[PDB]
Amino acid sequence: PNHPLWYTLCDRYGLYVVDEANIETHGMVPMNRLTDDPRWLPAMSERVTRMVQRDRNHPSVIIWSLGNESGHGANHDALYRWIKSVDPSRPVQYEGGGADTTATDIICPMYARVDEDQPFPAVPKWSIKKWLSLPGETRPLILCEYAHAMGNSLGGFAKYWQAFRQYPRLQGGFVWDWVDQSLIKYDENGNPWSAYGGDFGDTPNDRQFCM
Amino acid sequence: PNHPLWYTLCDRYGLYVVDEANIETHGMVPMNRLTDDPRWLPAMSERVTRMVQRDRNHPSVIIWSLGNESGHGANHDALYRWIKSVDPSRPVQYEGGGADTTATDIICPMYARVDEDQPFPAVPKWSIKKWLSLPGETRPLILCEYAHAMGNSLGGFAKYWQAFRQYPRLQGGFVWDWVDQSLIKYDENGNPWSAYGGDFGDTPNDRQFCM
Ligand code: NA
Ligand code: NA
Ligand code: NA
Ligand code: NA
């Protein structure tokens, strides 16, 4: 959840908002180790429920998200249903556990390609065109993350937009991402420069991957 | 319907058969002028019912077809349901009126392209990949006709097969077609040659389009 003024500005300037719970357990092995554990349901529940209680009156918020990169655990299904029950006005989405689980109203993959399948075990990223028509599948597809804009990037961006326009159920996506997470450091003369991972003696680090 | 021995040979050698009623009204304007007319329902009914009565015991017949290029009329819907009622063991298909009408269990277009849409009014031929995932669509797609093999042709054949293998619900198609409809004629020296439309003083004719 963002600083509260963000939603005010989105209401007034006009931007659709996905409001997302502060839950990410990416570094767990497997990713859902905590989110499938009932011991962690109370902590997770508050991050979902208290977001809804705060932001439910903002017209800019159109979709609730259960968090990010926390696998798919039973705690997600419980909290999916909680939101559906208290606020039927907004779809609920969540990418973890393969982007098309029982905890999401929207097929919301990250970095699924337009034409190319990436058939990873358990959590495949199908071609978005292919994903829509998998047997029994009927949901809209909106990428929660796509076109990773790291350094000299956005090659193939047009391929996404051609597909979005041709396919009714491909309803777009959210580019990753808006702004480089670089930080200002200063040389001996006080001149500023842009710093990334490892520049603060921080270790281990992931270097330029924050930009 | 074919010569009775055909089905016997398909049973024994092993080929899947689409058994198709002897109904084509292509030259009508619009194409469904007779098939939407209840005065023509008796004649149509016999071409469907007497086919089913004859061929229903052949294992090679896996799909019934209501005919070809007769638009989509109320007579098709009636006869679709008749077959569904008398023989639940086989899907019923029919391409007329846009290939995805209420008279077909299978999306069965003719010459719909792999990636390219052809948005004709009333009867569009969508890209086959796109067709599968149109809102509310769930049926399998098998082209009743594709890859028109007229003369020096079958350019782009590989493109269909790549799509068929990638997409579960793209389950193939039937090439148009097996054998040139050329006829032997004899020259002044009694030497045989292959003839097509117009070579018998037949007019109007459609020349080489029979091959
Ligand atoms: Na679209
Ligand atoms: Na990053
Ligand atoms: Na297939
Ligand atoms: Na022909």
Side-chain angles (χ1 to χ4, degrees):
Chain A
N2 276 208
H3 184 295
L5 186 66
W6 183 248
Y7 308 89
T8 308
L9 300 167
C10 288
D11 288 348
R12 295 178 185 174
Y13 280 104
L15 284 179
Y16 306 121
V17 172
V18 177
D19 206 3
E20 184 154 278
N22 185 24
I23 307 164
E24 168 155 3
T25 70
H26 203 158
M28 293 310 295
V29 178
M31 212 187 306
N32 81 342
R33 186 173 285 273
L34 306 178
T35 62
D36 202 40
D37 188 345
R39 184 184 296 266
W40 287 82
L41 175 59
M44 285 174 68
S45 71
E46 290 192 6
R47 287 152 186 268
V48 170
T49 64
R50 296 171 79 247
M51 166 184 70
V52 170
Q53 291 174 312
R54 191 190 73 163
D55 296 343
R56 59 181 296 168
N57 293 333
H58 283 291
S60 62
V61 178
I62 62 157
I63 293 156
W64 300 115
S65 174
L66 298 176
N68 191 63
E69 294 179 322
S70 302
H72 175 226
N75 295 356
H76 286 117
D77 300 314
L79 296 174
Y80 168 84
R81 184 58 205 159
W82 186 90
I83 301 173
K84 296 293 281 184
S85 171
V86 313
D87 180 27
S89 79
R90 300 172 173 95
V92 181
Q93 78 172 49
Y94 177 63
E95 181 278 342
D100 63 358
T101 70
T102 52
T104 193
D105 292 335
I106 299 165
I107 307 162
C108 55
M110 50 179 57
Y111 317 104
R113 297 174 184 195
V114 174
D115 300 304
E116 190 191 352
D117 286 344
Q118 306 169 79
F120 307 117
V123 280
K125 299 191 192 298
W126 306 114
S127 153
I128 60 177
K129 298 175 184 184
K130 167 179 173 162
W131 209 322
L132 287 178
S133 53
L134 291 179
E137 190 53 75
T138 60
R139 287 169 287 184
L141 192 155
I142 304 166
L143 297 123
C144 71
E145 295 172 35
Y146 82 112
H148 195 254
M150 180 179 187
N152 194 345
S153 197
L154 244 77
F157 196 66
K159 194 177 285 177
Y160 280 97
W161 284 89
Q162 189 282 328
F164 298 159
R165 291 189 168 97
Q166 185 181 11
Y167 281 64
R169 283 170 54 216
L170 293 179
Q171 295 185 258
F174 298 82
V175 171
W176 189 276
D177 66 351
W178 182 242
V179 59
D180 282 350
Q181 297 187 50
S182 55
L183 293 172
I184 297 300
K185 288 179 66 76
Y186 304 93
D187 70 18
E188 61 175 355
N189 296 307
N191 295 316
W193 53 272
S194 296
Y196 51 77
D199 288 336
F200 295 88
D202 49 311
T203 185
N205 68 81
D206 287 289
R207 46 182 178 83
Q208 71 267 36
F209 204 65
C210 58
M211 299 186 300
Chain B
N2 277 209
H3 186 291
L5 188 67
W6 182 247
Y7 308 88
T8 284
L9 299 172
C10 288
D11 288 350
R12 292 174 188 182
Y13 281 102
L15 289 174
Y16 307 125
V17 179
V18 175
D19 204 1
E20 185 153 277
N22 183 21
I23 308 168
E24 172 157 2
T25 74
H26 204 157
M28 299 303 297
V29 178
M31 216 188 301
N32 80 345
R33 186 172 286 273
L34 304 185
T35 63
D36 203 41
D37 188 353
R39 314 214 84 183
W40 286 84
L41 180 57
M44 284 175 67
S45 80
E46 298 196 350
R47 284 154 189 270
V48 171
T49 63
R50 302 172 76 244
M51 172 188 59
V52 169
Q53 291 174 307
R54 191 190 71 161
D55 297 338
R56 61 181 299 168
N57 292 341
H58 285 291
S60 55
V61 177
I62 65 159
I63 295 161
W64 302 112
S65 171
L66 298 174
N68 191 66
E69 299 180 316
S70 304
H72 176 229
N75 295 356
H76 288 119
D77 293 333
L79 294 175
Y80 166 87
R81 183 55 204 163
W82 185 89
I83 301 178
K84 300 291 285 186
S85 175
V86 305
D87 180 26
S89 76
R90 296 172 178 98
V92 180
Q93 78 170 53
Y94 177 61
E95 180 280 339
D100 63 2
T101 70
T102 50
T104 191
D105 290 332
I106 300 167
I107 309 157
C108 53
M110 48 177 60
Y111 316 103
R113 299 178 181 189
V114 177
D115 298 307
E116 190 189 346
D117 284 345
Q118 299 171 85
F120 307 114
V123 283
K125 299 189 194 297
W126 306 113
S127 153
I128 62 179
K129 300 180 183 175
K130 162 178 175 167
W131 210 322
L132 288 177
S133 58
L134 292 179
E137 189 56 68
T138 56
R139 286 168 289 187
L141 195 156
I142 299 163
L143 297 120
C144 69
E145 302 174 22
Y146 82 115
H148 197 258
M150 182 179 187
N152 197 346
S153 199
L154 239 79
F157 198 67
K159 197 176 282 175
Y160 278 97
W161 285 89
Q162 191 281 331
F164 298 161
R165 292 186 168 99
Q166 189 179 5
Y167 285 62
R169 282 171 56 218
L170 291 182
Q171 293 183 261
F174 299 81
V175 171
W176 190 276
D177 67 349
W178 181 243
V179 57
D180 279 352
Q181 292 188 56
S182 63
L183 294 170
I184 296 295
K185 277 175 77 82
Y186 302 94
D187 66 18
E188 54 184 10
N189 307 319
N191 281 322
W193 53 274
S194 296
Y196 52 79
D199 290 337
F200 296 88
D202 51 310
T203 176
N205 69 82
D206 287 288
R207 42 187 184 87
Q208 69 263 43
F209 204 66
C210 58
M211 303 183 298

